[PDB]
């Protein structure tokens, strides 16, 4: 319907795509680095989610330049996506309040 709802939907789909690609790319970037732990896909996908939500427990993280670059993309995609949802909620509340005031 409205632009904000559409944008929020698209952002969520975009995020899921970034989570999957980031998981795949993180493993590709980290294998070959002695000591790295972000090296199998199941846990890499878990890592991508706790990174996108900015929780970052510290159980897993990248040690290489390219793994870190991948991490930044996931971080920004998560922060932006969740932020966009907040903006969509605000727009919805603002429209409803204008109606309620009879504006």
């Amino acid at each position, epitope marked *: 319907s409205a632009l904000h709802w559409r944008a929020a939907g698209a952002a969520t789909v975009l995020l899921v795509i970034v989570l999957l690609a980031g998981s*795949y790319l993180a*493993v*590709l970037a*980290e*294998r*070959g*680095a*002695p*000591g*790295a*732990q972000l*090296i*199998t*896909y*199941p846990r890499a996908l878990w890592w991508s989610v706790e990174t996108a939500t900015t929780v970052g427990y510290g159980d897993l993280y990248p040690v290489t330049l390219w793994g870190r670059c991948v991490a930044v993309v996931v971080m920004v995609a998560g922060i932006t996506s969740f932020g966009l949802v907040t903006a969509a909620l605000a727009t919805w509340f603002v429209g409803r309040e204008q109606e309620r005031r009879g504006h």
Partner: antibody
Amino acid sequence: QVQLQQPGAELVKPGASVKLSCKASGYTFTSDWIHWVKQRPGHGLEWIGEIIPSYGRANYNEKIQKKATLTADKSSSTAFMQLSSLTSEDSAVYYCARERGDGYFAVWGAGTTVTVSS
Amino acid sequence: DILLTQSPAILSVSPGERVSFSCRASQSIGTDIHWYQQRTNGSPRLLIKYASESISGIPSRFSGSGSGTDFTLSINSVESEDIANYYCQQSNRWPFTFGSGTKLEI
């Protein structure tokens, strides 16, 4: 059916090189990695390296002298290992194994016995 | 690189008795340990994954346990076909590494 097919043997003259092959069957995923393991007679298993066919990137064991170069042919679903300038120290059984990106070697090839002799 | 220590190198047991193989990691690796069986002239065969997960087609007398640095592969009532070399392998940190192996004698 046999998931990984490797030739039974290869005779190599000292100083020369050889190209081992590992043909894969069964399910193939973008997350699959093909590994190579070396086993000298009477000795244990030694990891040589790995390659991800979907991207073509390979990594190698840093603890040993690099004698191998890994490549893969996506169309023929075959992984290759080029061993160069071999010595008698390189005589052994070389296995290829498939890992689904989750850390363990689910299936192994029969192994190729490489003998370095004149 | 993670060092996996398997000791003793040879384990002697009477037929039908329970036996346990030891694998110790140089640092804590959760449950990222896998076990393989290799008979004379054969290729390694996956027995247990992630320390204790059973694999389809593997006899029920095979089980694994442990976490952290100490792991164990156990065989309830060992039999002739169990005669082989057993190896542990870790996938917690790059690169993957193998233990030196333990031989089972009856």
